[PDB]
Structure formats: C-alpha cells, structure tokens
Amino acid sequence: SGFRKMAFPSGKVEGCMVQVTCGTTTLNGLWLDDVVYCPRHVICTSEDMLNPNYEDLLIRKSNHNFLVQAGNVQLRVIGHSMQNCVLKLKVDTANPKTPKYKFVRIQPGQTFSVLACYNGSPSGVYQCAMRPNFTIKGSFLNGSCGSVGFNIDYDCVSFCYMHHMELPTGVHAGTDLEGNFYGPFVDRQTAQAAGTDTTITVNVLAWLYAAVINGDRWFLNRFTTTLNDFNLVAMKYNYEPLTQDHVDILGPLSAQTGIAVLDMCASLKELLQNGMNGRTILGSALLEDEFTPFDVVRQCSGVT
Amino acid sequence: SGFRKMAFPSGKVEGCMVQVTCGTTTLNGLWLDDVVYCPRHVICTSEDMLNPNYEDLLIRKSNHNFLVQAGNVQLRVIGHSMQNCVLKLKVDTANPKTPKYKFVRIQPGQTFSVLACYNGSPSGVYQCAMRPNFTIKGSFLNGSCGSVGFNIDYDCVSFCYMHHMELPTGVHAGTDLEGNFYGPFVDRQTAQAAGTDTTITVNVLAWLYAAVINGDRWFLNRFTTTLNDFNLVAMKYNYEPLTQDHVDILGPLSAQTGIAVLDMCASLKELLQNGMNGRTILGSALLEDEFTPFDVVRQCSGVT
Ligand SMILES: O=C(Nc1nncn1-c1ccccc1)[C@@H]1COc2ccc(Cl)cc21
Ligand SMILES: O=C(Nc1nncn1-c1ccccc1)[C@@H]1COc2ccc(Cl)cc21
Numbered sequence: 001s002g003f004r005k006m007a008f009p010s011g012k013v014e015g016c017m018v019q020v021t022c023g024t025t026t027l028n029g030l031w032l033d034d035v036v037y038c039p040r041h042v043i044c045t046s047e048d049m050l051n052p053n054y055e056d057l058l059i060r061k062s063n064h065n066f067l068v069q070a071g072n073v074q075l076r077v078i079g080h081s082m083q084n085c086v087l088k089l090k091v092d093t094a095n096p097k098t099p100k101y102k103f104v105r106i107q108p109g110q111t112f113s114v115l116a117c118y119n120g121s122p123s124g125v126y127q128c129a130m131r132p133n134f135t136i137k138g139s140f141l142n143g144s145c146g147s148v149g150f151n152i153d154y155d156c157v158s159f160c161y162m163h164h165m166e167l168p169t170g171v172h173a174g175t176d177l178e179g180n181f182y183g184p185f186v187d188r189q190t191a192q193a194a195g196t197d198t199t200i201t202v203n204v205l206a207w208l209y210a211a212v213i214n215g216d217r218w219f220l221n222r223f224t225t226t227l228n229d230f231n232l233v234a235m236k237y238n239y240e241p242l243t244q245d246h247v248d249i250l251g252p253l254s255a256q257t258g259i260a261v262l263d264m265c266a267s268l269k270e271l272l273q274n275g276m277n278g279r280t281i282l283g284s285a286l287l288e289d290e291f292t293p294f295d296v297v298r299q300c301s302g303v304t
Numbered sequence: 305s306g307f308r309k310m311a312f313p314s315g316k317v318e319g320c321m322v323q324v325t326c327g328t329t330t331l332n333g334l335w336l337d338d339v340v341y342c343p344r345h346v347i348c349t350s351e352d353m354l355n356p357n358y359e360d361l362l363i364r365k366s367n368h369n370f371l372v373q374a375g376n377v378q379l380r381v382i383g384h385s386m387q388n389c390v391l392k393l394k395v396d397t398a399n400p401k402t403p404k405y406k407f408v409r410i411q412p413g414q415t416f417s418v419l420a421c422y423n424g425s426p427s428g429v430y431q432c433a434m435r436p437n438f439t440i441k442g443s444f445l446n447g448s449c450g451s452v453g454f455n456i457d458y459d460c461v462s463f464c465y466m467h468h469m470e471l472p473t474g475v476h477a478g479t480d481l482e483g484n485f486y487g488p489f490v491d492r493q494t495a496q497a498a499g500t501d502t503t504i505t506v507n508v509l510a511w512l513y514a515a516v517i518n519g520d521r522w523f524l525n526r527f528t529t530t531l532n533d534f535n536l537v538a539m540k541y542n543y544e545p546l547t548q549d550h551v552d553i554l555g556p557l558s559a560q561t562g563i564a565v566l567d568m569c570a571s572l573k574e575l576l577q578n579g580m581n582g583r584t585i586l587g588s589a590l591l592e593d594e595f596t597p598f599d600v601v602r603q604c605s606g607v608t
Binding site for chain 2 (some may be wrong): 004116118123140278286299304
C-alpha cells in the first residue's frame with residue numbers, strides 16, 4: 001500500500017528528446033520516426049515574441065537554419081513545415097529509439113507525465129493534470145519549451161502535450177502534438193489571463209477511494225446525497241459539476257470499496273463544508289485532484 | 305517557474321530491471337554488469353517469512369533454482385551469494401544497458417527517485433525521502449520488492465535503496481545495494497514498529513526558499529531568531545534539530561533570495577505556532593519536507 005503522485009517511466013520519451021536551435025534560440029524537440037516536433041516560436045527572437053507573424057518569419061528560414069542535435073550528433077534537416085503552433089522538421093534519419101506512439105488531445109481533468117527537458121536533455125519527470133481552465137501547473141524554466149506530456153499503455157506512448165509558454169500568473173500553456181493549444185492561448189508575449197481554476201471533482205472522489213483502499217477512512221460519514229444536491233455544494237466551492245458519466249467511471253472503485261459513489265459525494269460535501277480540521281488524507285491537508293479514477297485503479301493494481 | 309515533486313528521468317534504471325523467480329516467489333532484480341541484485345526473501349515461501357533462517361534456506365538453492373528474466377529472455381545464472389539481506393546472482397551476460405553507477409548509503413532527510421516495478425517491469429516513478437525514522441513513504445504493492453531508489457549525477461546513477469517490505473503501519477523499509485537495511489528493520493514477518501517520524505527541517509527551509517523564488521512570499525515575516533531559539537520550537541513540533549551544517553547547506557538559497565537563513569527560520573517558527581490559516585504554499589496546505597536544498601537548486605536551475 002501507500003499512495004504517491006506517480007509519473008509513468010520516462011525512458012521511452014527520453015529516447016526521443018532532441019535539441020532544436022534556430023538562430024540564437026534553443027529549445028527541445030520530440031524526434032519520432034524521421035520528424036522532429038518543436039514549438040514554432042523557436043524561429044523568434046525575444047523582440048519578435050511581442051507580435052510575431054509566424055508565416056512571415058518562417059519565409060526567412062531554410063532547412064539548414066534549423067539545427068537538430070540528438071545526443072552529440074547532428075541530424076540533417078531535409079524539410080520543414082508549420083502545423084498550427086508546431087514545426088515539423090523532417091530529418092534524413094528515422095529515430096532508432098522511436099517507441100509505438102499516438103498523438104492524442106486530452107480533455108480537462110486528464111492527467112499525464114511531463115519529462116522536463118533543457119537543451120534536449122532530460123531534467124526530471126512529474127505528474128500533471130490538464131486543468132479545467134486548460135492550463136497546467138508545471139515546473140518549467142526558460143528553455144523547457146518543447147518538453148512533452150504523455151501517457152503509456154503497456155508499450156505505446158500517447159503524446160498529449162507540448163510545452164510552449166508560461167503566463168504572467170506563473171501557470172503553463174501548450175499544445176497537443178498537432179500544434180493546437182489547449183485553451184484560448186496564443187504563442188505570443190501578450191496579456192493572457194487564465195479563467196477559473198476549478199477543482200476536478202471526479203478526480204477528488206477517485207483520490208478519496210484511493211485513501212479508503214489505503215486505510216485513511218476518518219472522513220467517511222453516515223450520510224448520503226444526490227447528484228443535484230452535491231452539485232449545488234460543489235458549484236459553491238468552485239468544484240466541477242459531477243455527471244452520471246463520472247459516477248459510471250468511478251464504478252470499479254465503488255465496487256472495490258463497497259462505498260456507493262453518492263455516499264462518497266456526501267463525505268466530500270462535509271469535507272468542503274466543515275474543512276479538514278487540521279487532519280490529513282494520504283498525508284495531504286488539501287483535497288488532491290490530480291489522480292484520475294484510471295490512475296487510482298492503475299496504482300492500486302500495479303499495471304506495468 | 306512552478307515547483308513540482310519531481311523524480312529523476314528513469315530510463316537508465318528501466319534498462320536494469322529484471323524479474324527474479326525462486327520457486328513460487330517472483331520479485332524484481334537490478335541487473336548491473338553480470339550481477340543481478342535482489343532481496344534475499346525471494347527464497348522464502350510465505351510460511352518461511354515468520355522466522356526465516358536465510359543461510360539454511362539458501363543451502364537448498366542452486367544456480368538453476370533462480371530464474372532471471374530480462375524482457376522476454378532468460379539469463380543464465382552461473383553463481384549466487386548472499387550479502388547481508390540481498391542476493392547477488394552472477395549471470396553469464398553483462399547487461400548491455402548498464403549505466404555508469406555507484407552504490408551509496410544515504411543519510412535520513414535525503415531524497416531519491418523510486419522506479420516501482422512488478423515482474424521486472426516498470427510501473428511508475430516517484431520522489432521519496434529517507435525519513436529520520438529510516439522508513440520511506442512509498443507506493444508499493446506485493447511484488448514491488450526489488451524496486452530501487454536512486455539519484456542521478458549527469459550520467460552516473462547512484463543506487464541508494466532497494467525495497468524489501470512494508471511494516472504493519474503501511475510504511476516501507478529496505479536496504480542499500482549492499483543489503484544493509486536502513487534502520488533497525490529485519491526482513492522477517494514480525495512486529496516491527498517505526499519510531500517517531502520527525503519533519504526534515506532543513507528540507508522545509510529549502511522548500512520555503514523555493515516558494516520565495518516562485519513568488520509565494522505571504523509567509524515572510526518581519527522577525528528573526530537564533531538556532532537555539534528556533535530548535536526549542538522545532539523540538540516541540542517534532543521537527544529535526546537544525547545545525548550550522550544545515551545553515552551552510554542552505555547558503556546558496558539564502559544568497560539567491562537575499563533572505564538570511566535565521567530570518568527564514570523565524571518565518572517557519574511562526575508557521576508552526578500560528579498555522580497556515582487556510583492558506584497554501586506552492587499549492588500545499590502543509591509544510592513539505594521531501595525536497596533537499598540540492599533538489600531545490602537543481603529544479604530552479606534546470607540541471608540535466
Ligand atoms: O513563456 C516562455 N517560456 C517559458 N516556458 N516555461 C516557463 N517559461 C518562462 C520562464 C520564466 C519567465 C517567463 C516564462 C517563453 C518566453 O516568453 C514567451 C512568450 C510567448 C511564448 Cl509562446 C513563449 C514564451
Ligand atoms: O511486506 C512485504 N511486501 C510488500 N512490499 N511493499 C508492500 N508490501 C506489502 C503489501 C501488502 C501487504 C503487506 C506488505 C512482504 C510480505 O510480507 C513480508 C515480510 C517480510 C519481508 Cl522482508 C517482506 C514481506
């Protein structure tokens with residue numbers, strides 16, 4: 001037992017990280033087959049970022065202006081194209097370490113691992129969730145752009161995120177691997193404010209089930225509630241509305257613990273109204289919302 | 305910016321994970337060069353665990369009774385020996401993916417990454433700290449034994465921990481890579497209670513410096529304190545005593561932020577006495593103690 005914020009093993013993604021340099025700007029790229037994917041803002045100078053016209057800036061660039069380095073070896077660029085906010089650099093060598101992969105666009109509330117990189121080299125790995133305001137709360141310094149978010153299904157890596165920027169508020173924004181930003185964010189150095197960061201209710205419930213599976217049961221109460229009554233309390237506390245789909249998703253956790261989803265909702269309702277009273281749940285003094293029901297089942301079963 | 309509980313990239317350690325089976329027991333092994341390291345309790349039946357005599361149980365085992373599998377290929381065992389609580393299985397093939405490595409024995413308060421494995425396959429990676437009572441608060445299910453804790457210095461992996469067991473209290477115990485347990489624990493299914501789990505004070509301070517570097521400054525106060533006055537408060541709150549060595553270690557963080565260590569100690573003193581008052585620091589409602597000053601500097605500088 002024990003419950004930890006766990007990331008997927010990162011080896012498969014480490015084998016794909018490369019350094020992309022254009023002019024004086026250096027960031028990370030993801031090398032899959034004979035294509036290197038990187039944020040398009042690699043072609044900008046800090047002076048361009050204020051109001052960049054990427055199509056115009058790109059006309060000034062040729063295959064030889066994009067320097068791609070994997071380890072200490074230089075890859076030859078034989079083509080370049082812009083797809084939304086990402087650049088695809090066709091190289092002459094297929095990545096020999098290319099894992100089985102997919103490009104997916106995740107929904108808010110979904111979690112993923114981030115392999116934070118600098119100059120194409122891995123720095124660390126941590127677990128994130130796509131917030132309901134389409135930002136992530138990462139750990140990203142200057143040069144981390146191009147680091148990716150991913151999930152693993154046995155041996156297939158699903159790439160879901162590519163890091164592009166930090167907003168003035170310190171939160172992070174980026175795209176899926178087709179270059180489309182999550183949320184209303186643009187790759188421009190301009191006033192961009194995030195919307196309300198609500199709590200991912202279904203994930204809090206999944207984490208409450210993980211706590212009961214791990215022996216932390218103090219919060220379990222004698223009450224029950226309805227989806228409508230629960231959602232009235234949830235909206236008041238900036239919690240996402242809970243749907244019958246979320247109740248269904250929690251089904252296996254409800255089955256394993258013998259605690260009906262609506263009973264767990266009433267326990268959570270009392271936690272919101274009464275607070276934690278100086279107590280902890282799985283060593284946390286706040287309600288954790290960055291474990292999906294799938295992450296909870298996965299960790300408590302030992303999927304490899 | 306942003307501050308996350310970050311583990312080291314795990315690829316280098318994934319390339320070393322193997323499955324070791326003896327009789328009906330299957331656990332994980334670490335394959336470095338032509339040696340596979342695993343917990344010695346692999347030779348026990350659940351019935352033996354109550355009071356095992358490892359030297360006697362080992363006499364009944366031969367090289368061919370230890371089945372080592374790396375991926376889907378079987379390694380040939382040409383020798384076996386017991387070193388403290390670990391078995392070293394000499395195989396006929398050196399691990400081609402052996403990274404540069406060291407075996408280190410860490411001190412309490414030190415952090416490390418865990419690559420949780422099942423049947424020699426990686427399940428996930430998370431960040432731990434060796435508690436001052438020599439336990440770890442991991443996420444380990446049956447079969448996770450043999451999973452290792454490690455740190456990375458550029459390209460050299462320092463293996464510091466091998467998982468062996470869970471105590472009745474749900475906390476975890478294990479050895480360094482020479483088979484010596486951290487703490488007073490024995491690899492036996494017997495009543496083993498951990499001592500006081502105190503907070504790692506120097507790590508809390510390092511995390512308070514990480515918060516100031518990341519903009520969370522609400523807790524900074526107008527006061528200062530002395531090591532003796534601070535330690536009187538710290539002992540009352542089950543915090544580890546702070547030494548001049550810890551003040552020295554925090555030196556670079558103090559230099560970067562312009563906040564003297566003793567001023568940060570007075571801020572922490574007030575947090576202990578007055579509480580958080582419903583507030584958060586780096587999104588946490590409790591004081592985090594599982595980032596060393598080195599982890600803070602590393603994350604805030606982007607070491608790869
Ligand atoms: O945000 C950016 N990079 C970054 N990535 N993670 C954190 N930060 C960062 C670190 C420190 C301070 C500020 C930001 C770059 C710089 O300014 C822009 C403007 C637009 C874009 Cl698309 C990208 C960027
Ligand atoms: O603790 C053990 N394994 C394990 N590793 N992580 C968590 N657990 C675990 C999971 C569920 C329940 C209880 C334990 C084994 C089983 O019992 C013993 C007795 C002695 C030793 Cl040295 C090892 C073990």
